Design a protein around this ligand. Structure first.
Ligand SMILES: O=C1C[C@H](c2ccc(O)cc2)Oc2cc(O)cc(O)c21
Ligand SMILES: Nc1nc2ccccc2[nH]1
Lengths: 196, 188
């Protein structure tokens, strides 16, 4: 992750004009759309929270929680902490992903519902605060990622603009025909529902 | 550095009682003494600043500044960002670190924040002297409860060190209250 932290603009996009800030959301949405393509709804919920964080919920299978043989930690943690064909229909870039988002977030909350169990983990600037842990039981399945962008990295344009997210999620709904995409803004109660 | 950030206590020691905090200073001092042994003057200056940072100056040859062929960055940056515990551990657990290297007629400068370099090592001027200066601000996210440096803990340790390192001048300076010491044993 130190290569990303050193030159964040090279991975996520321009960190001053708002390109990078919003691409953080689109990388998390990318992961969610790939996961959503295997569900009992195929729906994602993108929420802009009042504290200037964004959460993305999907109803997919859930990120694998078992221990990775080589790394010796949960497979979820490996995904969060290890880094013309680059384009993806889900909207992210190959060679970026959620590990870059995690590295450039002052906080990231991961919640996985899988195999009848709720798993939780917290990161700060890409560093796990404890191992992925079973915190309860559940009937549902899915992955939730909520991230607080690092205000050290992202300057000038620090607040999430609704219209920039809404525009991109509309484009993605046409490319991802089966998937439902809900956008919610808790600052002013604004909302949209994109489905092809 | 991610391994150090995940479990800081395993490398630097206890981050709550103050022992880890002062070990950050002593790790840098061990490196500075080492560097000092290479020039003839052999002098290091340890300063406790008013903004709760510690700087350590030496008059050695300077950390190598040329490009590392594998990493493609200055050898100094490789030293500061790759895993005594090593200076890279001190860098990782410092919310800010300033590096100033005097070498081959040139002043080189670089700033880090939590181990991450903010720009490449840059030649900013000229000098007739040689040496390395590391000034670090301990990360308040890691070091809790006991956050401030204690003069007596440093003063005592630097005195013990002076007797094991003959010819090395060790100056201690406290900018908070103007207190200073000079440990310089010339035996053997
Ligand atoms: O590993 C280090 C750290 C050390 C250093 C660290 C802090 C400080 O205040 C002074 C020097 O300088 C070096 C100088 C070298 O030629 C080779 C090295 O591998 C090192
Ligand atoms: N505030 C802050 N910024 C950080 C960057 C990398 C690792 C830890 C960090 N804490």
């Amino acid at each position: 992750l130190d290569a990303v932290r050193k030159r964040p603009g090279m991975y996520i996009g321009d960190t001053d004009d708002g390109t990078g800030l919003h691409h953080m959301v689109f990388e998390v949405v990318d992961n969610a759309i790939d996961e959503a393509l295997a569900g009992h709804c195929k729906e994602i919920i993108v929420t802009i929270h009042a504290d200037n964080s964004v959460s993305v919920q999907d109803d997919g299978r859930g990120i694998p929680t078992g221990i990775h043989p080589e790394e010796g930690v949960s497979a979820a943690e490996v995904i969060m902490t290890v880094l013309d064909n680059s384009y993806k229909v889900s909207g992210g870039l190959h060679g970026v992903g959620v590990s870059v988002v995690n590295a450039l977030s002052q906080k990231l909350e991961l919640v996985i519902q899988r195999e009848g169990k709720i798993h939780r983990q917290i990161y700060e600037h890409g560093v796990p605060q404890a191992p992925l842990a079973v915190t309860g039981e559940t009937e549902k399945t899915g992955t939730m990622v909520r991230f607080w962008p690092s205000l050290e990295t992202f300057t000038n344009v620090t607040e999430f603009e609704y219209e920039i997210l809404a525009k991109r999620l509309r484009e993605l709904s046409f490319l991802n025909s089966g998937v439902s995409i809900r956008l919610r803004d808790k600052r002013d109660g604004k909302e949209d529902h994109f489905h092809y």
